[PDB]
Amino acid sequence: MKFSNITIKNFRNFEKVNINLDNKNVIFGMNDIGKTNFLYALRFLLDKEIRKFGFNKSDYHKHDTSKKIEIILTLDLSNYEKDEDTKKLISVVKGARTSANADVFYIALESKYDDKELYGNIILKWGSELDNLIDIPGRGNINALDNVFKVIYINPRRKMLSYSIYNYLAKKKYEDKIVIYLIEEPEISLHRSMQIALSKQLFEQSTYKYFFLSTHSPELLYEMDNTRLIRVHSTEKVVCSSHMYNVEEAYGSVKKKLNKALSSALFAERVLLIEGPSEKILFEKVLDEVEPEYELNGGFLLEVGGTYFNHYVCTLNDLGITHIIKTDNDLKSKKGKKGVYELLGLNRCLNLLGRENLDEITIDIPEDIKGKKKKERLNERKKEIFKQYKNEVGEFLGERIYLSEIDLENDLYSAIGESMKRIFENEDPVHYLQKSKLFNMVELVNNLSTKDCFDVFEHEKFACLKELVGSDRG
Amino acid sequence: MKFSNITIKNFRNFEKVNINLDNKNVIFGMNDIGKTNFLYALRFLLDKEIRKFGFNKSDYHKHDTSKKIEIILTLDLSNYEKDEDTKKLISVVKGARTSANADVFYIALESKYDDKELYGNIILKWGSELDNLIDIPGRGNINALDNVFKVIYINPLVDLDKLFAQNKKYIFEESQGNESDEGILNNIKSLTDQVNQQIGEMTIIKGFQQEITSEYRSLKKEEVSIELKSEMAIKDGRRKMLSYSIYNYLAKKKYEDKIVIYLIEEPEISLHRSMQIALSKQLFEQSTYKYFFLSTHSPELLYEMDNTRLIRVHSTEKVVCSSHMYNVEEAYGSVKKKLNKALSSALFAERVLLIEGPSEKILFEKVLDEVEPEYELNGGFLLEVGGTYFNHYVCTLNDLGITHIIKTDNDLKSKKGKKGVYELLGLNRCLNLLGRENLDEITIDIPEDIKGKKKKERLNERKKEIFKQYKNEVGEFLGERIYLSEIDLENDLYSAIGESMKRIFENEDPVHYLQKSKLFNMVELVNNLSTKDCFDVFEHEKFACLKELVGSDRG
Amino acid sequence: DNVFKVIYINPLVDLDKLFAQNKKYIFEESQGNESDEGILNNIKSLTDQVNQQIGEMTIIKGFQQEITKGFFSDIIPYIKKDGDSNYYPTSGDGRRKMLSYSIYNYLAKKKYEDKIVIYLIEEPEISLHRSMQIALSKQLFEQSTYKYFFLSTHSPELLYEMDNTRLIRVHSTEKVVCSSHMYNVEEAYGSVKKKLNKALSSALFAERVLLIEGPSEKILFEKVLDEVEPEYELNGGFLLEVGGTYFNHYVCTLNDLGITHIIKTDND
Ligand SMILES: Nc1ncnc2c1ncn2[C@@H]1O[C@H](COP(=O)(O)OP(=O)(O)OP(=O)(O)O)[C@@H](O)[C@H]1O
Numbered sequence A: 001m002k003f004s005n006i007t008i009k010n011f012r013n014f015e016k017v018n019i020n021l022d023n024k025n026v027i028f029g030m031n032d033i034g035k036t037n038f039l040y041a042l043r044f045l046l047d048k049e050i051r052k053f054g055f056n057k058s059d060y061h062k063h064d065t066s067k068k069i070e071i072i073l074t075l076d077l078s079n080y081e082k083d084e085d086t087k088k089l090i091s092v093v094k095g096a097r098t099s100a101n102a103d104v105f106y107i108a109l110e111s112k113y114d115d116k117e118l119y120g121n122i123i124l125k126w127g128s129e130l131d132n133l134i135d136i137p138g139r140g141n142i143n144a145l146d147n148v149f150k151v152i153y154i155n156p157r158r159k160m161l162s163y164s165i166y167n168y169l170a171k172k173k174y175e176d177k178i179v180i181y182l183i184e185e186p187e188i189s190l191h192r193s194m195q196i197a198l199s200k201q202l203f204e205q206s207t208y209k210y211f212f213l214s215t216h217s218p219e220l221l222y223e224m225d226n227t228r229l230i231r232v233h234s235t236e237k238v239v240c241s242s243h244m245y246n247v248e249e250a251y252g253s254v255k256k257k258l259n260k261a262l263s264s265a266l267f268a269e270r271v272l273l274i275e276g277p278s279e280k281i282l283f284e285k286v287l288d289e290v291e292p293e294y295e296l297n298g299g300f301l302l303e304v305g306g307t308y309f310n311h312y313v314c315t316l317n318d319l320g321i322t323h324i325i326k327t328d329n330d331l332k333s334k335k336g337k338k339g340v341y342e343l344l345g346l347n348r349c350l351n352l353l354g355r356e357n358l359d360e361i362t363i364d365i366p367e368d369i370k371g372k373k374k375k376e377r378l379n380e381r382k383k384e385i386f387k388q389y390k391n392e393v394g395e396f397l398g399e400r401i402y403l404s405e406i407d408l409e410n411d412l413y414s415a416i417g418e419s420m421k422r423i424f425e426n427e428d429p430v431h432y433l434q435k436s437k438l439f440n441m442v443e444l445v446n447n448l449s450t451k452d453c454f455d456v457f458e459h460e461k462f463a464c465l466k467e468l469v470g471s472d473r474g
Numbered sequence B: 001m002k003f004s005n006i007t008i009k010n011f012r013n014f015e016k017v018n019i020n021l022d023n024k025n026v027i028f029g030m031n032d033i034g035k036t037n038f039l040y041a042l043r044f045l046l047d048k049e050i051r052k053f054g055f056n057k058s059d060y061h062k063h064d065t066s067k068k069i070e071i072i073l074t075l076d077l078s079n080y081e082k083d084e085d086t087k088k089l090i091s092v093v094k095g096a097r098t099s100a101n102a103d104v105f106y107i108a109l110e111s112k113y114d115d116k117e118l119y120g121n122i123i124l125k126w127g128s129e130l131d132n133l134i135d136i137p138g139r140g141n142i143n144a145l146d147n148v149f150k151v152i153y154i155n156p157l158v159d160l161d162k163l164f165a166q167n168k169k170y171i172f173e174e175s176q177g178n179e180s181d182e183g184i185l186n187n188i189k190s191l192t193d194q195v196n197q198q199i200g201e202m203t204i205i206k207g208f209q210q211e212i213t214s215e216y217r218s219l220k221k222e223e224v225s226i227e228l229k230s231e232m233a234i235k236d237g238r239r240k241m242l243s244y245s246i247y248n249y250l251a252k253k254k255y256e257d258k259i260v261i262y263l264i265e266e267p268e269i270s271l272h273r274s275m276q277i278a279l280s281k282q283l284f285e286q287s288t289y290k291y292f293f294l295s296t297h298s299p300e301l302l303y304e305m306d307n308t309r310l311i312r313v314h315s316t317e318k319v320v321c322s323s324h325m326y327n328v329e330e331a332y333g334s335v336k337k338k339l340n341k342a343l344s345s346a347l348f349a350e351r352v353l354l355i356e357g358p359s360e361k362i363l364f365e366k367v368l369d370e371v372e373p374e375y376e377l378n379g380g381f382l383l384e385v386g387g388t389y390f391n392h393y394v395c396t397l398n399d400l401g402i403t404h405i406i407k408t409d410n411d412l413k414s415k416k417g418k419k420g421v422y423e424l425l426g427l428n429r430c431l432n433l434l435g436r437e438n439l440d441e442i443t444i445d446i447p448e449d450i451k452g453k454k455k456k457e458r459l460n461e462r463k464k465e466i467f468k469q470y471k472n473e474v475g476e477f478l479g480e481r482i483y484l485s486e487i488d489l490e491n492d493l494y495s496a497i498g499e500s501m502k503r504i505f506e507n508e509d510p511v512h513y514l515q516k517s518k519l520f521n522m523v524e525l526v527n528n529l530s531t532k533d534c535f536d537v538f539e540h541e542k543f544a545c546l547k548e549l550v551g552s553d554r555g
Numbered sequence C: 001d002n003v004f005k006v007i008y009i010n011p012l013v014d015l016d017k018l019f020a021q022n023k024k025y026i027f028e029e030s031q032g033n034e035s036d037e038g039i040l041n042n043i044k045s046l047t048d049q050v051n052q053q054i055g056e057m058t059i060i061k062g063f064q065q066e067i068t069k070g071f072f073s074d075i076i077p078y079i080k081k082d083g084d085s086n087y088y089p090t091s092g093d094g095r096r097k098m099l100s101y102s103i104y105n106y107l108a109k110k111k112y113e114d115k116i117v118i119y120l121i122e123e124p125e126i127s128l129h130r131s132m133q134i135a136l137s138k139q140l141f142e143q144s145t146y147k148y149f150f151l152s153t154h155s156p157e158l159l160y161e162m163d164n165t166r167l168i169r170v171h172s173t174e175k176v177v178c179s180s181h182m183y184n185v186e187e188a189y190g191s192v193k194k195k196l197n198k199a200l201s202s203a204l205f206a207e208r209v210l211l212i213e214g215p216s217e218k219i220l221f222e223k224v225l226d227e228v229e230p231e232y233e234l235n236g237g238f239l240l241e242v243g244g245t246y247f248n249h250y251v252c253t254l255n256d257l258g259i260t261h262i263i264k265t266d267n268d
C-alpha cells in the first residue's frame, strides 16, 4: 500500500542511513555523494538480475569487510479491502505475519563476507516484527519475492518511445504484480517542454503508482504534488533529509507559480527569500559587484510575492537548506472598513515561529492633504510599532528573519545617503524611488558605482547578504 | 581569425542550409531536428578520424545517391597583424590565395556516390575564390588541413579511462617534449620509475614470478620468462570535471602550434545546476575556449552568455536554421545577469508573451491554468521584462524565428526637477520598438488643492485623450502583435469581469482597491475567480494576446 | 559449491579478461609483514618527495594555481623471451593460450586444494603447434595435474599418449547417439604402445576403417582408390596399417565406438 521507511545500515557510501519514504518519491542532491547507490540498494533488494551476482569487497563501507550489510524496507499495509496490492503481498507471505501486528511489514537483506572464496552472499528475510525475521523460501533460482514485485529500471525522440514501450508492457503484462519504477536521470537528451510533459505524466496520471526518481533538472518538478523529497547533503558523512511535499487546498490558484519558484530553489544550499523584482535588481547588482560567484557556491534568490512564507520555509527547513528572510513592515488597509490597518508584515513574520495573528490597530486621519503627510504619519506609526515589539524583533534576529523598520528604501537611504541625493537630485530620494519601483531602481543601479555596493553589503541593515554569502566573522 | 559562414547541401536531413557563424556558437532546437548532424558536418570536414571512413548510403538526403554532398566553410582573415592563428593558416595554404589583400578563405568538401563499389568518396578542396578551388595536397594518409586544425570532441558518455589510456603515452610525450623543461624532473622521474621496480620484490609478486614460470616450463622447457607491470598514475560529474581540465591542459601543452576547435555535445548530462553555472562562466568569460560549437538543452549554460552566436534549428516547412549575434550593450551591463536569467529560458520556446511584472504572471497563469493548461508543453512562455528593455528581447527572439507578443500599459512618468510635466512611457517604448523616435514631453495643469484620488482620474482622462490622439499608431501596434492598453491592466479586467470584481472585493471601486496593493490583492481576486470568469477574460477582445499565445485559430 | 570447482576453458581465451577476473584471489592477502616493511616504508617515503614539487619551472603548478597505495588493479602479465628487454603488447595465440592454462593450473593447485576440480576443455588444439599438442597430450594423460577432465577435440595429435581413458564418440545413425569405450593398453603391448597410439589416433576419426597388413597393400589400394573413388577419405574411409599382430586391440576399440572395421588379410 505505502512504503514507510528504508534503513541502509551498511553499504558503499552509507554508515547509518534512515530515510522516511512514501509512494512517488524523488531524490536529489549534489554530485558524487550518493543517490545512485540509493537506487542500487533497491535493485539489490527487489530486482533479481542484480541480486544474483552477490556482493564484492567494494560494496562494503571503506573496504572494511568485517561488518554486515543490512538493508531493511518497511511497508505500511494499514488499508485492507481497498487496494489490491495488499492482498498481492499477503497471499504470498502466508503466515510469517501475526494478527497482533496486522499493519507493518519488514523485508530485510543481510550479507556477511565469506573471506575464503571472497564472496558476499545475500540472505533475504521477511517478517511482521523486526526481531524474529524468518528466511524467504525459494525452490531453485526463484525466490518467493519474485512473484510479488516487478521492478522496471529506466536509464537513458527514441527515449519517449522507450518510455511508451515499457508503459505498454507494464499495462499489458503486469496486472498481477506490484510494479516499481526506478527512473534514473530522465532529463538527459530531452527538451524542456518534454520534461514538463514527463513531469505532468509522472505526478498527475495514475500509471506511475510507485516510482523512485533521480534528477538534476528543475523542469521535472514543475508539476509536483503529494510526493516525498529526499535530499542527500553535500557533506562527506552522508545525511539524507526527507519531506512530505503537499500543496494545500488554499494554494490551488497559486500552485503553478509556487512550484516554478520552489523547484529551482530546491537545488541550492542557502536561499534568500525576497518580495519583489526590485529587490532582485538591487541584490543582484550588489552581489555582482561584491561576491560574483554566489550561484556557484549554493546561493539563491527566491521571489515570494505575498503567500505568507509558510510553504517555502517548511519545505526548505525539512530538507536542511538554510533559509534567510529579508522583508519589510507594511500596514494593509482592511476590506470595507475605514481607518483600520492590519499589521501584515509583522503577522507574516509571526506565523513562521508559530503564534497568533496580532490585533489590528487604528489611527484617526482627518480630511486634510493626503499626498505627502499621510505617508509620514504611517511611517511614524510604523516606527512606533517597531519600537513597541522589540523582543519579538530580537526573536526574529535569533532566526534568520530580518524585518525592516519601514521599508527597503529607508534602509537603502540609511546605507548610502549622499549617493542617492547625487544620482536622483531631489530633496528626498526615498519618495522619488517610491513612485515607479521598477524604473527608478534601474536608474539607481545604472548610476551606482563601486564601493557604494560595499557600503550596502557591510551595513547592519543588510546582514542577510552576509548570511547568503556565508562568510563568517568569528 | 574568425569563422563566418557554413553551407550544407544534401546532408542526411539537411537539403540546403546557409548558417552564419562566429568563434563561440550555441546550437539549440527540438528533439530529432538536426543538432547532431550539424555537429557531424564539422567532424567530416575538419577531423580526419571521421573523414577517413567515407560516406555511406545513409549520409545522403532521403537516401538519394544521385545528388552530391557539399560542405563549404568560410573564414575571415582580416586580423593577420593581431592573431597567431591566421599565421598558422597562411603558412600551410601559401600558394592558393588569389591577391595580396584577400581576407576571405574557403574550405570545401565534395562527395559523389559510387554504385558499383557502394562507396562515398570525400574530396577536400580550399581556395580564396569559390570558383577556383584547388585540391588539398597530401601524401599517404595525411593531407594539409591536419597540420593546422585539431578538433576536440567532448561528450559526457565517454569516461576518463579511454582518454587515460592515451594519457599513458601522453605522459611520455610530456617527459620528452617542451624543450626538456621536465628534464630537471627527468632524472627523478626515473626515481619514480624505480618506485615501480621495487614493487616487484614483495614476495606475493616474487612467488608468482617463479611459480608461473615453473608451471610454464613443464611443457617443452621453453626459453621464456613471465614479467608483471602496472604503470599507473594518480590525479559521473567529478570525472567529467576532471576530464575538462585534462582537455584544457592537453590543449595548453600539445596544441600551441595548432588551431583548437571544441565540439561540446550536451554538457549538462549528469552535472549539477551550480556546475552548469560554473561551466557557463568558464565558457563565456575565460579565454581558454577561443573557438567552440556547443549543443545544449539546459538554460543554466546560458546564464553568462555574451559575444556569442545563437543558432536555432526549427521546422516550419523544411529543416531551417535561424542565427543571431548576441551582444549586450554597455548601458545594459548593470542588469546583465537578470537579462540572461530571464532570456535563457525564453530561448527554448515557440511563442513568448512579454509581460511587465508578477501580477500579470499571477492572473495569466491562473487564466491559462483554467483554459489551456498544456500551454507550456506546446511552446508557450511568459517573460517578465520590467517594462524597460523591449528592444533587446524582441531583437533576440525575432532574429531566431520565435514569435514575440507584447502586452503592455499606457503609463506616464514624472520628470525630475520640473513640476507638472510628464513623459509618455508606454507609447515611447512601443514606438521605439517600431524604429520611430521618442516623443516630446507633455505638461498637465493640475492645481495643488486637487490631490489624492481625483488626480488619478484626471491622469486617466488625459491617458484616454492620448490614446484617442494616436489611433493610427495603435492600429500599427495591433498589426505587429503589440497590445497597448488604454489605461492599465485593471481597467481591461474591469471591462472583462467587473461584475465579479464588484462581487468579490465588495466595494463600488474594485480598480482602486486592487491598485492599492498590486501583489496582495491580486491573489485575493484570483483565488475567488470561477471557471466562467476565466473564460470571459480569455474570450475578451482586450485580451487577444492570450489567444495569440496559445496558437489556436479561435480568434 | 563447497565440493566442486568447475574450470571451463573455451577456444577463445583472452589473457587480459581471465587475469583481471582472477586478480581477486592472488595479490589480495595481508600475510603479516613478509620481512620487507621498511622497503614498503621506502615506497611511502619516496612518494612524499613527489606530490609537493611537481611543477617543473612553475608551468603546471601555476596551471593548478589558477583553478584555486593499493595500485595492483591494472597489472598486466607479459611473456619475455630471453635476450630481449622490450615489452611488446602484441603476442600470438600459441603462448597466450598456454599462459592461461598455466594460470588455471596455478589457481587449481593453490586456491582450490580443499575442493574437487573438474576441467571442461573445448578444443585445445586451436592455434597450437604439433609438438605443443604432443606435450599437452603427455601432460593430460601422464601427470597428475588433470585428475578429472572432460575433453573435446578434433586433432589426432592430442591422442598420441592416451591411456586409462574413456573415449566417447558422438555420431548419427537414426538419432544423435554416443558410443563409449574404456581404453587401456595392456602389459603385452607396453613396448609397442606409441606406435599403436600413433596408428589408432587417426583411425578414431573415421567411419569405415580397412585394416591392412603392410605398406605394399597401401600402395596398391591407394592406386585403385585413386583411379576409382578418389574422394573416399572425404566420405569417412581410412586405411589402417596393423603391423600383422595387433588384431584384437584395434577391433575392440573400433567396435565399441560404432566404427565399421574391415579386415583384409593373408593365410600365413
Ligand atoms: N565502497 C565504498 N566506500 C567508500 N566510498 C565509496 C564506495 N563506493 C563508492 N564510494 C564513493 O561514492 C562515489 C559514488 O558516487 P555516485 O555515483 O553515487 O554519485 P552521484 O551523486 O550519483 O553522481 P553524479 O551526480 O555525478 O551522477 C564514488 O565516487 C566514491 O567516492
Ligand SMILES: Nc1ncnc2c1ncn2[C@@H]1O[C@H](COP(=O)(O)OP(=O)(O)OP(=O)(O)O)[C@@H](O)[C@H]1O
Pocket: A157, A189, A190, B011, B012, B013, B029, B030, B031, B032, B033, B034, B035, B036, B037, B038, B058, B059, B060, B061, B062, B063
Ligand atoms: N539520410 C537521412 N535522410 C533524411 N532524414 C534523415 C537522414 N538521417 C537522419 N535523418 C533525420 O535526422 C534525425 C536525426 O536527429 P538528430 O540526432 O540530428 O537530432 P537532435 O536535435 O540532435 O536530437 P536529440 O535532441 O534527441 O539529441 C533522424 O531522426 C531523422 O529524422
Ligand SMILES: Nc1ncnc2c1ncn2[C@@H]1O[C@H](COP(=O)(O)OP(=O)(O)OP(=O)(O)O)[C@@H](O)[C@H]1O
Pocket: C088, C090, C091, C092, C093, C094, C095, C127
Ligand atoms: N615490433 C616488434 N619488434 C620485435 N618483435 C616483435 C614486434 N612485434 C611483435 N614481435 C614479436 O613477434 C612475435 C609475435 O607473434 P606472432 O603472432 O607474429 O607469431 P605466430 O607465429 O603467428 O604465432 P601463433 O602460433 O601464436 O599464432 C612475438 O615473439 C613478439 O614478441
Ligand SMILES: [Mg+2]
Pocket: A035, A036, B236
Ligand atoms: Mg548519479
Ligand SMILES: [Mg+2]
Pocket: B035, B036
Ligand atoms: Mg543528438
